[PDB]
Write a protein that binds this ligand. Sequence first.
Ligand SMILES: *[C@@H]1O[C@H](CO)[C@@H](O[C@@H]2O[C@H](CO)[C@@H](O)[C@H](O)[C@H]2NC(C)=O)[C@H](O)[C@H]1NC(C)=O
Ligand SMILES: *[C@@H]1O[C@H](CO)[C@@H](O[C@@H]2O[C@H](CO)[C@@H](O)[C@H](O)[C@H]2NC(C)=O)[C@H](O)[C@H]1NC(C)=O
Ligand SMILES: *[C@@H]1O[C@H](CO)[C@@H](O[C@@H]2O[C@H](CO)[C@@H](O)[C@H](O)[C@H]2NC(C)=O)[C@H](O)[C@H]1NC(C)=O
Ligand SMILES: *[C@@H]1O[C@H](CO)[C@@H](O[C@@H]2O[C@H](CO)[C@@H](O)[C@H](O)[C@H]2NC(C)=O)[C@H](O)[C@H]1NC(C)=O
Ligand SMILES: *[C@@H]1O[C@H](CO)[C@@H](O[C@@H]2O[C@H](CO)[C@@H](O)[C@H](O)[C@H]2NC(C)=O)[C@H](O)[C@H]1NC(C)=O
Ligand code: NAG
Lengths: 71, 228, 310
Amino acid sequence: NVFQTRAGCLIGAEYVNNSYECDIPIGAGICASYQSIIAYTMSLGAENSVAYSNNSIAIPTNFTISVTTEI
Amino acid sequence: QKLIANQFNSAIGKIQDSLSSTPSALGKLQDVVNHNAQALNTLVKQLSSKFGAISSVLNDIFSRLDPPEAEVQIDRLITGRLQSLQTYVTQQLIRAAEIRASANLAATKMSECVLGQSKRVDFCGKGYHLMSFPQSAPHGVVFLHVTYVPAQEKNFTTAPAICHDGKAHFPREGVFVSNGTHWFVTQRNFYEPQIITTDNTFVSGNCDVVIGIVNNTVYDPLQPELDS
Amino acid sequence: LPVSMTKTSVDCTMYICGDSTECSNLLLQYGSFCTQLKRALTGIAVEQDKNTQEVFAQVKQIYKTPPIKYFGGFNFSQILPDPSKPSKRSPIEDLLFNKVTKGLTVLPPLLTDEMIAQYTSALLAGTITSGWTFGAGPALQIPFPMQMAYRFNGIGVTQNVLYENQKLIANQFNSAIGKIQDSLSSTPSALGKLQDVVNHNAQALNTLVKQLSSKFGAISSVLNDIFSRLDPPEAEVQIDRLITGRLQSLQTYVTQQLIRAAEIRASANLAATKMSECVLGQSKRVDFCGKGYHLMSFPQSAPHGVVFLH
Ligand SMILES: *[C@@H]1O[C@H](CO)[C@@H](O[C@@H]2O[C@H](CO)[C@@H](O)[C@H](O)[C@H]2NC(C)=O)[C@H](O)[C@H]1NC(C)=O
Ligand SMILES: *[C@@H]1O[C@H](CO)[C@@H](O[C@@H]2O[C@H](CO)[C@@H](O)[C@H](O)[C@H]2NC(C)=O)[C@H](O)[C@H]1NC(C)=O
Ligand SMILES: *[C@@H]1O[C@H](CO)[C@@H](O[C@@H]2O[C@H](CO)[C@@H](O)[C@H](O)[C@H]2NC(C)=O)[C@H](O)[C@H]1NC(C)=O
Ligand SMILES: *[C@@H]1O[C@H](CO)[C@@H](O[C@@H]2O[C@H](CO)[C@@H](O)[C@H](O)[C@H]2NC(C)=O)[C@H](O)[C@H]1NC(C)=O
Ligand SMILES: *[C@@H]1O[C@H](CO)[C@@H](O[C@@H]2O[C@H](CO)[C@@H](O)[C@H](O)[C@H]2NC(C)=O)[C@H](O)[C@H]1NC(C)=O
Ligand SMILES: *[C@@H]1O[C@H](CO)[C@@H](O)[C@H](O)[C@H]1NC(C)=O
């Protein structure tokens, strides 16, 4: 398994078309992870198209109380 | 009130469990401790370096060589150890400046999140900030940010203004929404439809200027009183 | 605002000793200096990656603008991505990109320019289609005129003021966007901060390389020349003087890199705060998100930095 990347050439992992969140940063948008060891292009996030129109409004009908920690 | 209290209690229990189970969340203070220990360990270990001299033991250098050359060797040892010590001090100064910046940020967070409610978005956690709670930790502080998060949204048809008797009525505090046949005025962050009256709307101008203005009646509370 | 500098790494033994093994053996007597240099540079690199991540990765969703781009007369073509352009960069972003130009290595950044462009496009789509609601929870759509009426009401001006002269406000906004594009394309020193970052890095590297030709009080600056013209007993002295000079130069370089990394980290923290408090919401802090009463801000990606349109 030999893969050529922008940061260098990586030996020991195979490139996978599937995209996951970054696990071990490599460089130039490529990350490696252990599922054997695989290399992939990191995914920024899940796409979400907002239903925009000039006469539609979305109003929340409920709420949730959230607690988060900052260190 | 009961639902909000239950949600708050469940959230606190969940936070306790999450800290109990996730080790990597509390990694910043551990990194501080590791950095200090590693720097001190490296400084100690540097003592066993020859620094270009023949021996790393100072008294061995005195004893095994003549003083004319032992002095040069000891000068090399002394300058090497001074270089090591000043490198340690410089790195400590830089790290101390970083920690001072972090502590200033922590004090600002305390003042603006714990001692009051902050309108700054994302400063006191994700969502609309309600209140915060401080907790002490080794070499640091932990904040418990309580936030309000909207949920279960619903589609509505909205209009900038309502045209009535040739007058344009704008929402005093809320927005105009319609469920398909009737129009109501509701507050922006929570769905509470209400009858559009003259008490929760204000009039400004005629209907030929506003774009998207729609036709609907506006109830007047006073009319039934003098009707009788 | 600058966000990150270039991730650089140095080969200690290669920089100081070339291809001489005796020089490396002599260096082995000096302890773990090269180890400290490696640790410092690795920390700087991961710090740069973290700076970019904190500044730009503020949303967990990738929002898309609707195909029908009519927002009540407001023209956003100058800041929205250009599908015709292969790089999918906005015209202002393209102008910004155009206007900014051994033993030593430069590590590529973790996030490519396309990913940062996608982040900025997601931020713009979220702040255009959903107002500021997407920064505090689920994205709730709202017509742009009503969002702008919200923002006018935020600064103490009633809704009717905006609704009665919407067309004038839209024309003023479009003219302002055109003027800011022209001002960026005309004034050459507007982007001086990022260029100073690039120039400082290049100058530091060039000075470090140039220092390698200094005699440092020895008879020659060439290592093989000394090893070939002199017998050992004074050769150790000459080589020791050379290698101690080169450790001084390298340590000075690392110290300045650490200080500059701290400065860039402070700038990146400021940029992240500005993103959160001006792009994801409306700020009442005066002179923080531009001169005057703040309405909304638009982010634009730039080399080694970010540009805010207040
Ligand atoms: C409000 O209405 C819009 C459109 O009527 C909804 O958007 C649709 O969502 C479905 C679900 O994926 C898509 O298949 C459609 O293509 C969307 N339509 C448009 C025009 O984008 C939206 O989901 C509704 N909001 C809620 C909360 O139900
Ligand atoms: C808002 O959401 C809460 C939950 O987050 C809803 O509370 C639930 O109500 C149903 C029926 O009343 C109960 O069966 C559930 O056990 C409740 N959940 C909890 C956690 O107690 C509440 O009903 C929602 N409000 C509206 C108007 O839909
Ligand atoms: C929109 O909401 C209004 C008020 O909530 C609805 O009007 C009422 O509808 C109920 C049930 O259909 C009737 O029993 C009432 O008599 C109605 N009130 C009046 C004053 O007419 C209306 O039906 C809703 N429209 C839709 C499409 O759901
Ligand atoms: C809202 O109500 C006004 C007043 O009835 C409507 O204006 C009328 O429009 C019709 C047809 O366009 C004209 O023949 C009348 O002379 C108008 N009356 C006045 C007083 O101007 C208006 O069209 C209504 N809006 C909508 C969308 O139907
Ligand atoms: C929005 O702005 C763009 C450019 O700022 C406008 O595009 C111009 O359109 C006119 C005529 O339609 C052309 O003569 C110009 O050459 C165009 N400029 C550029 C840079 O392409 C556009 O018309 C405006 N309006 C809309 C709805 O997009
Ligand atoms: C909203 O936009 C659609 C198409 O983009 C247009 O047909 C319609 O007239 C617009 N609504 C108003 C009130 O202008």
